[PDB]
Amino acid sequence: WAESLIGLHLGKVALITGGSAGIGGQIGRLLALSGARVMLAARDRHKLEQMQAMIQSELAEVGYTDVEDRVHIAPGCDVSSEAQLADLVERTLSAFGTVDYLINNAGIAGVEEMVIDMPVEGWRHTLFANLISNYSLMRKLAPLMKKQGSGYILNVSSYFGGEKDAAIPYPNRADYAVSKAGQRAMAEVFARFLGPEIQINAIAPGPVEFARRARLILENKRLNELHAALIAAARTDERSMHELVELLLPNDVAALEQNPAAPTALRELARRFRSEGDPAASSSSALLNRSIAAKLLARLHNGGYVLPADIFANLPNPPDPFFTRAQIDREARKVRDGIMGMLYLQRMPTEFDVAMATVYYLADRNVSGETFHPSGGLRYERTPTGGELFGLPSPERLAELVGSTVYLIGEHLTEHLNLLARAYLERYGARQVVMIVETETGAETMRRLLHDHVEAGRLMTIVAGDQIEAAIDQAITRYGRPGPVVCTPFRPLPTVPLVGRKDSDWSTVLSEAEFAELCEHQLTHHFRVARKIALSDGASLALVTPETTATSTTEQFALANFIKTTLHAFTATIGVESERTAQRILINQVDLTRRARAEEPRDPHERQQELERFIEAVLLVTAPLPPEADTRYAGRIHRGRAITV
Amino acid sequence: WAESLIGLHLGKVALITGGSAGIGGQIGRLLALSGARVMLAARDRHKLEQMQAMIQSELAEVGYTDVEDRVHIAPGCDVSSEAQLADLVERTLSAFGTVDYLINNAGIAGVEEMVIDMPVEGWRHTLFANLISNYSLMRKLAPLMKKQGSGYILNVSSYFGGEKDAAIPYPNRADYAVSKAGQRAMAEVFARFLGPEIQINAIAPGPVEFARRARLILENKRLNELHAALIAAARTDERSMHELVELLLPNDVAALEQNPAAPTALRELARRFRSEGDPAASSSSALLNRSIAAKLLARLHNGGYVLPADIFANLPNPPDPFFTRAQIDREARKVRDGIMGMLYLQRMPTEFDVAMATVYYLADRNVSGETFHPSGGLRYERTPTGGELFGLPSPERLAELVGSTVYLIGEHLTEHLNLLARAYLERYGARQVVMIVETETGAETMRRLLHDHVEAGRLMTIVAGDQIEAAIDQAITRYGRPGPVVCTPFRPLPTVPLVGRKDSDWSTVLSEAEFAELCEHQLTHHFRVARKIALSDGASLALVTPETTATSTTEQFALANFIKTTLHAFTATIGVESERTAQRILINQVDLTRRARAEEPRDPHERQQELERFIEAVLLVTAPLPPEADTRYAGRIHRGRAITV
């Protein structure tokens, strides 16, 4: 079975991160059998040593000599650490000289929470481990590849990272999905810079060869249902959220349902806990447990709701089991049957099979910027991205903007922010616009542009710096919770080179730190705002990408399209998350980036048309749905989409 | 170099159509070296014999015995002929028994004209040769594959067939592009039916390893510029098209430019012929030649314009050269530099390289419904498809509908047609709606639904049968040329099975004839209407796909999505064709098909919302642009798009 493989990559040097197990281990095994010298990097020393010994044993079985020189390991390598990535490259260049194949395989599952339960630092960590690490290794190895005239970078992404012009929602995995899409987008936009010497592609395998995941799902469901009913009750009830949460403290499902003074939202919820509940489960008679209550408390605190930290100190603890074994097993089969039902071929691919297809694929010298699917045949929802043909929203949705509180977030795009503030205030009857900027200089700029609305008290300015959540809390406390929110980036895109000339040191090329800062300002910025605004009961949120113009540098076009593709994964995922958990908020994306310079406006007239389209796109995605119109069918259409100005 | 290959497909039987040259020849060569027995089909006997002898010689070089039993040929096989496809299968099953790999490689370039110069029968022929043939061979070989428990169908499509959720415009090649997209779409929608036993994938290679093509381009440019100016002059000038064309008969560029009574459109055109012309070229001093004049005459006759067949009989013939060698060579380098500039890797892949990647890929058992790109790294325009978030068009575009002549084409979708007719007539001030149906029963149905508008003379009905062009000519002559046009299919989708049970004869499965009829009513129908309406100076055209509902059969969903994906290639291509040749008409697509049953409306309320969205989508794509608004920038946004209701 190795006969097809032996010799296929003879003389190549490959670095495989995450090379101690999984796909990465098999790719390293097969690359070495095909004749390549391989450096396997991983965290655990012991498993890496076992993988090394197994591969060297196999190489010797098929006739290779000096097998210890063909398989090296780099234990203790945490790819989230820029310092350790540098160490990894130095160790690999020392062992083998120039790397021919960089296999960016290492990946962590990430936080595995809904965005609104996802710590910001946890999100950052996934980006560092899964995405920024890929750029960092390319930035260190591509100069040697280009000097020698050939190289290959392979980013091991995922089917759930999406595809060209389509995003795949991965609920409870937004950090993972963004990092997987960014891996693909990196290949797509760097291919033209890295060519002709260097190929860069991604692979996007689907699922490859449990009661605890099911219990967590059921616990998360209970959390979401309580949070959603509380949030909803609080926007119409006269009682504070504090007083609403006290209704849960007897922790008695029947008593809440039967309480004539409880909000309908909570009474109807308790009714369905009793109806849909397993009578042998204490979750059918008790509202929550202490674990769910702490997580619910964190959601409410994080959304600026005011209530004491010990409000659940005396919560009566429900007797075990909170969910019955039958409920957990039923959900576990629901998850299993769901993954199996994805497969057209009704069979799970193995890691070995997937690595084999990848190693063959690596021999192809005519592909760059592609995403190869070594396994596939998947039935799954996808969200097409990039509609340009759109009109204004309906009068009924536009009517919901009258009297609303608008938050606008930005700094660099002053003309866009000024036109948007004036549209909401002058055309659609918004009560107030809270302008949330990064710096004092940005605040003063907006205050001068909007001086008429500032002097009338319709335009408030807040300076956020890098503390956008605290700024939003200021806005909640002083001006009220937002209806529509528009989130634009604070920073422009950098203009440094993305590759260096063949004979240079690459000293001016986009650094690893600058790429991480790109992600901070152009991806994490939007994640933080979406997380905070969803927790704070915002009605709608438009995530706006950087602007490209007819004069943007070719490098800005690349980074802009990288961000646009990567953010689509976030927008699709949180859109479905919000829909599936009965959250009201409409989250969508407005793209100011285009693929090609020739598509941009060329004269003042076309520029006016473009700014008009920008206003219409934001209104289309931010005008709230009247509650009667928010059917299952219309709900999906107005969540998690992206349109291009 | 064959060591990796030998044994890889040992014991497999492969049928390769178009197997005498090109990619197909190399795929057959490499499959045979990998151990498969191959049947190579082609038209030319001699080249097929040469390919057979070369492959058998190579097999013997690497140690195979009885090489005449491993490489068979089927000469004289025209895959556009259903009778010959049957003969081909019988000859192959006779030689080898069951086919394991069907490599649907045969393809013709097609008509290589703009849609408005493309004969309808020529389009049909491309569909038969390139697309229907693929279904026909699968329909004949899949039962034996499924009975034996394994099979593979590989459709050799093209990068220019597009991708999931994105269409690639291929101007002057609409018939080719549709057939290439249909090849991919066939794999995408049949994968779930053909699994688990049978894999079906497409490959989509890009360009693979001249003065005459350039001259034709320049001749086509001259034709387009004259046609566009004539068409435009005729819609505002008091003179008939006949009298306008007589202005060209002195065939004198300077005289036309200098004619104070000539329409501005023709005078400005002649000025640019003189300005942009090579003075050594007779095309700088003469308007046209007899070849261009005949083709222009055909465009005008085909658009229902009335003028004598011999109007150009006395056209003075311009002295050679009409275009100078310098002009032709300049255009030829423009085409060459354009193809080379597509390649990120700055190198043309070879047929051998592409076949090698394909043969490796064929060993992958975990992929179905995919499109593998064996070469890629291409910089090219793509048109994202499938935006769902859209509003109504602007008031300024909606104003252009007042007083207009609307054509509506359809039969099956009576409720859609009734609502659309009433919207245009009752809400947007259209002067008249010409309802163009397939049958008398459809006409009487629409006349009863719209009886109020029929009795007022606002709703005219015409019965088209399978002669939609003659019906449109009736409509032009009697009611005037159309402004907006909506083209819906006459027929519903069939409900027969798409695969048969493992042990049956497949007798009820969708036949080769039924698939061809599917293409006739769901693709060629739209092509014929787009061709005719563009020639007849229609202002806008919405191509509407079949409707899926929450209760459509799983088979209807498959065929619906096949059509939707395939028609996207047509819509994108003719949209760019129209834009690039300064045609006014806006051609777009409105999709009534969704991917998943769960996305459809479930109750009367959601159904009402859906019909509302249908009306808004059609208005969005059919409301004409005010001429001042039809900038380069806005022009691209409003042409060649698709949106999903």
DSSP assignment string, B195-245:
TTTEEEEEE-------HHHHHHHHHHHHHHHHHHHHHHHHHHSSS-HHHHH
| C-beta separation of A405 from A480 below 8 A | yes
Q: Is B621 annotated as a binding residue?
A: no
B7 φψ region: left (φ > 0), alpha (ψ -120 to 50), beta (else): left
Q: Is B1 on the interface with A (CB under 8 A)?
A: no
> In Å, how far is B335's CA from the nearest CA of chain A?
18
Q: Report whether B454 belongs to an annotated binding site.
A: no
Using the Cβ of A394 and the Cβ atoms of chain B, whether some distance falls under 8 Å is answered with yes
Q: Which residue has the tokens 């005289």?
A: B255
Tell me how long chain B is. 645
- Cβ neighbours of B363 in A, within 8 Å: 4, 356-357, 360
Which token pair is A262?
Answer: 């409880």
CB A500 within 8 A of CB A116: no
Experimental method used, please?
X-ray
Say whether A602 and B8 touch across the interface (CB within 8 A): no
Tokens of A329: 């097993």
List CB contacts (< 8 A) between A623 and chain B: none
Inter-chain CB proximity A387 and B387 less than 8 Å:
yes
How far is it, in rounded angstroms, from Cα A202 to Cα A187? 6
Distance CA B100, CA B150 (A): 7
Q: Give the full edge-to-edge strand order of the sheet including B540-544.
A: B459-463, B432-437, B405-409, B484-487, B540-544, B586-591, B642-644
Q: Which amino acid is at B237?
A: D
Q: Is A240 helix (H, G, I), strand (E, B) or coil?
A: coil
Fold of A13-209+348-383: Rossmann fold (3.40.50)
Residues 6 or more apart whose CB falls under 8 angstroms from that of B94 comprise none
Q: What is the DSSP letter of B316?
A: P
Residue B76 in contact with residue B85, Cβ under 8 Å?
no
Burial A221-234 (b: 16+ CB within 10 A, else e): ebbbbbbbbbbbbb
List Cα–Cα distances, A209 to A103, A241, A282, A353, B38, in angstroms: 20, 46, 36, 10, 34
Reading the block at residue A396, the tokens are: 């009924």
Could you tell me the two tokens for A112?
């595995």
Q: Specify the amino acid at residue A112.
A: E
> What is the least distance, in Å, from the CA of A196 to any CA of chain B?
4
Say which CATH topology domain B385-497+506-644 has: Rossmann fold (3.40.50)
Look at residue A49 and give its three-state secondary structure. helix
Task: Give first-to-last CA distance, chain B, whole Å.
Answer: 52
Tokens of B13: 């039987």
Query: Where, residue-wise, is CATH 3.40.50.720 in chain A?
Result: 13-209+348-383, 385-494+511-644
Q: Which residues pair with A13 in a beta bridge?
A: A37
8-state DSSP, A387: B
Whole-number Å distance between alpha carbons of B326 and B319: 16
**Quick check: B599 contacting A, CB < 8 Å?**
yes
Q: In this complex, is the C-beta atom of A579 within 8 Å of any C-beta atom belonging to chain B?
A: no
Collapsed DSSP state (helix, strand, coil) of residue A168: coil
Nearest CA of chain A to the CA of B66: how many Å? Answer: 23
Fold of A385-494+511-644: Rossmann fold (3.40.50)
Instruction: Identify which of A78, A79, A84, A28 has the alpha carbon closest to the alpha carbon of residue A58.
Output: A28
| Spatial CA neighbour of B511 closest among B127, B104, B138 | B138
Q: How many CB pairs under 8 A join A and B?
A: 256
Q: Which CATH code fits B13-209+348-382?
A: 3.40.50.720
Q: Are residues A525 and A437 in contact, defined by beta-carbon separation less than 8 angstroms?
A: no
Q: Contact B390/A389, CB-based, under 8 Å? A: yes
Which residues have C-beta within 8 Å of that of residue B461, sequence separation ≥ 6? B434, B435, B436, B437, B443, B446, B447, B454
- Nearest-neighbour CA in chain A from B507: distance (Å): 24
Q: Using CA atoms, how far apart are residues A479 and B392, in angstroms rounded to an integer?
A: 33
Place of tokens 């040329």: B481
CB B265 within 8 A of CB B584: no
For B376, the closest of A349, A369, A388 (CB atoms) is: A369
H helix or E strand, kind and range, residue B542? strand B540-544
Tokens of A119: 């710590």
Backbone angle region of A348, left / alpha / beta, with phi > 0 → left and psi within -120 to 50 → alpha = beta
Return the sign of the alpha-carbon dihedral for residues A339, A345, A348, A353.
negative
Cα–Cα distances (Å) from B563 to A297, A476, B478, B548, in that order, read 51, 50, 33, 12
Q: In Å, how far are A406, A430, A458 from A453, measured between CA atoms?
A: 13, 12, 5
Question: Contact A377/B366 with Cβ under 8 angstroms?
Answer: yes
- What Å distances lie between residue B249 and A96, B262, B452, CA to CA? 77, 13, 49
B583 labelled ligand-binding: yes
Tell me which residues of chain A, numbers 166 to 185, contact chain B at a CB-CB cutoff of 8 Å: 166
Whether residue A384 has a cis bond before it, omega within 30° of 0: no
Which of B582, B578, B466 is closest to B528 using CA atoms?
A: B466
What is the spatial distance between Cα A7 and Cα A25, in angstroms, rounded to a whole number?
19
Q: How far apart are the first and last CA of chain A?
A: 52
Which helix (DSSP H) or strand (DSSP E) does residue B14 occupy?
strand B13-17
For chain B, give every residue range classified as CATH 3.40.50.720.
Answer: 13-209+348-382, 385-497+506-644
DSSP A139: H
Please name the residues in contact with A98: beta carbons below 8 A apart, sequence gap of 6 or more: A13, A144, A145, A147, A148
Q: Does B268 touch chain A (CB under 8 A)?
A: no
Specify the pairing of strand A101-104 against strand A151-156: parallel
Chain A residues whose beta carbon lies within 8 Å of the beta carbon of residue B542: none
Interface of A with B in 448-467 (CB under 8 A): none
CA distances from A53 to A25, A68, A72, A94, A95 (A): 12, 9, 10, 21, 17
How far apart (Å, rounded) are the C-alpha atoms in residues A83 and A228?
Answer: 43
Q: Do A394 and B389 touch (CB under 8 A)?
A: no
Q: For chain A, positions 315-354, list CB contacts with chain B under 8 A.
A: 343-347, 349, 353-354
Vertex B333 angle, CA B331 and B334, to 5°: 60
Burial state string for B244-266 with b = 16 or more CB within 10 A and e = fewer than 16 = bbebbeebbbeebbeeeebbebb
Which residues in chain A have Cβ-Cβ distances shorter than 8 Å to B633?
599-602, 606, 609-610
Note whether B382 contacts A165, CB cutoff 8 Å.
Answer: yes
Question: Is B375:B349 a contact under the CB 8 Å cutoff?
Answer: yes
Interface list for A 365-384 with B (CB within 8 A): 365-370, 372-377, 379, 381-382, 384
